[PDB]
């Protein structure tokens, strides 16, 4: 059976805290943006010739414009302010555990925000060869998990150290693995 | 850039189902249960620090319906091309044999946003304690959705996530077992 | 305190 989708995204883009804000009102139909309002532009602009008659109608109403203009303030900075309290300033620090699959895994889990820095070390030396990461995975519930295998078949008496850094713990977390 | 807050809503015909939600850097702030007319925080604890007027989300959707209708007819009524979902199954933390864990079925990159998802323990449908996210918005305007099954890892248990969709030839299964 | 919500224009008929 045939499907039809109307779709609207209202975007608030924040640079340097809320120094620079930019606002996008985007109208789609079936994966096709036909008209948007860009706070950086001032008026409604048509994206495909399907939305050209719409955006000409909408910029005629000068009341509409003035109003949409100030969403960067009324809408954007406003919502930021409200929620910064528990989104921006949200830090949950990682849960790190090292173990070899049956070659060495470093499993950081349940952390926020995204940006994270994992490094493998061999005997106090930074390994840069065998680093094979699964990259930053989204858990979907305001937590992230990532894994970083190290490609080493080792020798007895060596110490491997996984070194996590994150904006929720100042001095780095470090886990150990003796061969 | 630093932070991106997006208010993504939509109305799909002829199913006549809507959704309204707030996205912060990928994660859901909240959505609005259209039926119960409720604001619903992705985490209970958001309730403390902010509030949303559920009705507002309705009056919006009801415009997107009106839009939908005029937009379909302004395009010979051309239907939406399905994109089928890719599905990935994983455990929210390293797995221990008798530690309680949780299975994530992560449905990614698809449209239109409708799926008939099922969990399968040893082959039999599970319903005990499952939670599911609402439809979440991507940069390319395709959809994401998660699902969650809390389980006790055992050596005699094999779970599967049964995603359906109108882009798939046959129902897809992603099988995780220890 | 409250999260303000942006309102889509109704498309001219």
């Amino acid at each position, epitope marked *: 059976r045939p499907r039809f989708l109307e779709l609207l995204k209202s975007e608030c883009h924040f640079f340097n805290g809320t120094e620079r804000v930019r606002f996008l009102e985007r109208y789609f139909h079936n994966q096709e943006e036909f008209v948007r309002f860009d706070s950086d532009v001032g008026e409604y602009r048509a994206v495909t010739e399907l939305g050209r008659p719409v955006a000409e109608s909408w910029n005629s109403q000068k009341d509409l414009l*003035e*109003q949409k*203009r*100030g969403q960067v303030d*009324n809408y954007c900075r*406003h919502n930021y302010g409200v929620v910064e309290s528990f989104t921006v300033q949200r830090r949950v620090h990682p849960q790190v555990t090292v173990y070899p699959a049956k070659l060495l895994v470093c499993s950081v889990s349940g952390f926020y925000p995204g940006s994270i820095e994992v490094r493998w070390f061999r005997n106090g030396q930074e390994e840069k060869t065998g680093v094979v990461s699964t990259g930053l995975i989204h858990n979907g519930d305001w937590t992230f998990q990532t894994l970083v295998m190290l490609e080493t078949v080792p020798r007895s008496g060596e110490v491997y150290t996984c070194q996590v850094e994150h904006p929720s713990v100042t001095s780095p977390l470090t886990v150990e693995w003796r061969a | 850039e630093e932070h991106v807050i997006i208010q993504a809503e939509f109305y799909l015909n002829p199913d006549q189902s809507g959704e309204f939600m707030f996205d912060f850097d990928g994660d859901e702030i909240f959505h609005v249960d259209m039926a119960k007319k409720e604001t619903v925080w992705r985490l209970e604890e958001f309730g403390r620090f902010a509030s949303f007027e559920a009705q507002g989300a309705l009056a919006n959707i009801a415009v997107d319906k009106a839009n939908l209708e005029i937009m379909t007819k302004r395009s010979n009524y051309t239907p939406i091309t399905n994109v089928p979902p890719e599905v990935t199954v994983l455990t929210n933390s390293p797995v221990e044999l008798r530690e309680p864990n949780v299975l994530i079925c992560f449905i990614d990159k698809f449209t239109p946003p409708v799926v008939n998802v099922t969990w399968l323990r040893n082959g039999k449908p599970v319903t005990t304690g499952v939670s599911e996210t609402v439809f979440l918005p991507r940069e390319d305007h395709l959809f994401r959705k998660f699902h969650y099954l809390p389980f006790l890892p055992s050596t005699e248990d094999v779970y599967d996530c049964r995603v359906e969709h109108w882009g798939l030839d046959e129902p897809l299964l992603k099988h995780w077992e220890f | 305190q409250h999260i303000r919500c942006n309102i889509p*224009k109704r498309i001219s008929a």
Partner: T-cell receptor
Amino acid sequence: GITQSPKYLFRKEGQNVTLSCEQNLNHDAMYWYRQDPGQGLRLIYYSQIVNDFQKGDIAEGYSVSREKKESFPLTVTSAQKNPTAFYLCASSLRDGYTGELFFGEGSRLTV
Amino acid sequence: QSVTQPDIHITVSEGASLELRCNYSYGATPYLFWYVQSPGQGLQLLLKYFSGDTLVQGIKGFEAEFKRSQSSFNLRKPSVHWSDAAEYFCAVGASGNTGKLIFGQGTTLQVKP
């Protein structure tokens, strides 16, 4: 633009008078306020879309229903010795806004 | 969310200058309106202010200024008129946001020759 009536509705006690409010401005949301002298207008009930409606500040003993997008009638139960005041009705649309409020001429109730 | 009109009754001469004053509960970017009501009837919108321009005009040569710093949105006329005697109401677009307006208790105004 909004027509309330009748303008003056003197009424017995324990009687459930219902104040009618119609609008052909094609507005989406619709409101009732009661103006008690010296104080501002106080919000009674308002409906943002058809068939939904939510309490304002002084909502005890009033009820309203929104079956039609054009009609929002306020029923004054003998709830309180509220009643003897002046009732006001307004509407507004959402396209971009959040449109300004538009006001009916209002009606005086008595007892 | 909250508005307050400090003058309860302002008297003034025909031809003089008018300034009904009105203050607002702290808000950043609130929406403000001035309404006027002749006895027995409804309110006309005199003028509004969402954002941007600091000073706006209204009907029957009215004016209002938005002093962010001041938390004040005061109504003005340079040359009042006899017609203008009614109750004036100040109202704020409330609070993240409808739709619903909050009114100040309203300052009434009579004018003499």
